Amino acid sequence: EIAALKXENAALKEEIAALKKEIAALXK
Amino acid sequence: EIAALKXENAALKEEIAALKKEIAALXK
Numbered sequence: 001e002i003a004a005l006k007x008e009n010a011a012l013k014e015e016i017a018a019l020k021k022e023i024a025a026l027x028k
Numbered sequence: 029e030i031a032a033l034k035x036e037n038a039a040l041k042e043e044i045a046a047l048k049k050e051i052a053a054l055x056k
């Protein structure tokens with residue numbers, strides 16, 4: 001469960017990184 | 029560690045929800 005939770009965390013962090021990149025493209 | 033990981037998960041999910049709300053406001 002720790003490993004599975006760690007992986008959900010990495011996936012959410014990557015989605016957060018992509019969403020910020022989408023915001024930057026929208027603002028430019 | 030499971031509880032702490034669960035909480036990081038809830039915080040990331042709330043940031044994802046806010047970032048999508050920010051994208052919707054930018055697109056409108």
Ligand SMILES: [Cu+2]
Pocket residue numbers: none
């Ligand atoms: Cu990897």
Ligand SMILES: [Cu+2]
Pocket residue numbers: none
């Ligand atoms: Cu709460």
